[PDB]
Design a protein around this ligand. Structure first.
Ligand SMILES: O=C(O)CCCC[C@@H]1SC[C@@H]2NC(=O)N[C@@H]21
Ligand SMILES: O=C(O)CCCC[C@@H]1SC[C@@H]2NC(=O)N[C@@H]21
Ligand SMILES: O=C(O)CCCC[C@@H]1SC[C@@H]2NC(=O)N[C@@H]21
Ligand SMILES: O=C(O)CCCC[C@@H]1SC[C@@H]2NC(=O)N[C@@H]21
Lengths: 117, 117, 117, 117
């Protein structure tokens, strides 16, 4: 259910593979930020989710460095995959920039991303 | 650097390998919550950090399933590594549990972990 | 334009008054969790927002104690009012529960609520 | 145990009164950011906490507008008060700044502040 191409509401594109070993691999292309072109992502997901019918927990990270640019920052998405005819991957994320210790207080942005097929 | 065995304020053990490609790989062992023994982890980090004094942005994910147990959940840690004198990794984290859609408002915990050696 | 009766995506009811000094006062009624009927809320908003299309920052707090129940918890919403046809209030919130110190790591839930009238 | 003067790790000064009804009122002075002098705060706390050694849930909001300047932004702190010889208020916070809708994705900073007497 997770393997595939996914899109968030910012227009970003999440390309991923969910391996049988609980691993997540692919690329992310931000529609915003100090970004351009695809960035490597990787993460993990629950390969044996609950019987009851709850979403499948997962999470992944992108460090915003690629051959084209480096924003000295990383985002992690934490959320759950939700099957349906309207499958969704519902996330909250944390984006931390490298800062001096003085500015550490403002190092991290927080947001929410909803991904659709 | 970032490669090594680290411990957070809770006494959790974070065993990690920072690859020249920007990969993070190791194991996480949780002192608390619905967990036992080590869990696979994967993440990303800025392989070419700023030099002026900024920390090195990083992130990683744990899906809380292994050979012994499954919490049907996953945490992502987002933070910056601060090295030199007493190296530190300062993070913020999101722990998302699979849930029913009606319980989704209460799927995600938020916190902060600080790690040293 | 903040003064009014708002509903979030969960169906909870936010009845607010934005005073001329920057105060938010009213009641919150949650459709979910360990709550029933109305709770006092209080908070602040930017009385002089910029005039560049930027939204209006605000925040409020509810302690989940009232004459019928006490969950021994508090939520705070931080966000901005967005004017227009579809006037909206977009927030992120933090729900802290009184825990012991050993359980504090899991004291705080995080989410995001969008309100309309 | 909450009424009085408290200090966070960043130097800021939180002067607060916890009223009998669960009211938090007072004033915040920030050592950091787009702030000068003191700002009004208001919030709520659990005035009937548990007796099982659990902490006391509370939160407050600051809108960063006062007589001297306006950052067009607001912070909410959500946390719990822990008394004893080593009394503290442990919080996590969300700082939302007014922004256009296109920049809403980067509107909110998240962090944590520990307050001491
Ligand atoms: O550091 C930067 O500015 C680039 C980060 C990428 C932009 C963020 S990550 C969270 C959110 N979801 C997206 O698709 N884009 C933004
Ligand atoms: O409880 C679960 O869902 C699985 C165990 C999670 C433990 C969390 S992850 C964030 C925090 N840091 C730790 O070392 N442990 C907790
Ligand atoms: O469960 C509790 O401890 C008290 C009820 C809190 C309900 C939460 S507050 C954030 C979210 N938005 C709502 O309208 N309800 C939930
Ligand atoms: O930057 C602004 O818009 C005004 C100053 C904000 C101060 C922030 S609120 C979170 C953090 N904790 C503090 O004590 N100060 C900063």
């Amino acid at each position: 259910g997770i393997t595939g191409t996914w899109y968030n509401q910012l227009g970003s594109t999440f390309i991923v593979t969910a391996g049988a070993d609980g691993a997540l691999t692919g690329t992310f292309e931000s529609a915003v930020g100090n970004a351009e072109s695809r960035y490597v992502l990787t993460g993990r997901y629950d390969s044996a989710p609950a019987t009851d019918g709850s979403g499948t927990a997962l999470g992944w990270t992108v460090a915003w460095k690629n051959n084209y640019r480096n924003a000295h920052s990383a985002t992690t998405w934490s959320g759950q995959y939700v099957g349906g005819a309207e499958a969704r991957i519902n996330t909250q994320w944390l984006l931390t920039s490298g800062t001096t210790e003085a500015n550490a207080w403002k190092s991290t942005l927080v947001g929410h991303d909803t991904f659709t097929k």
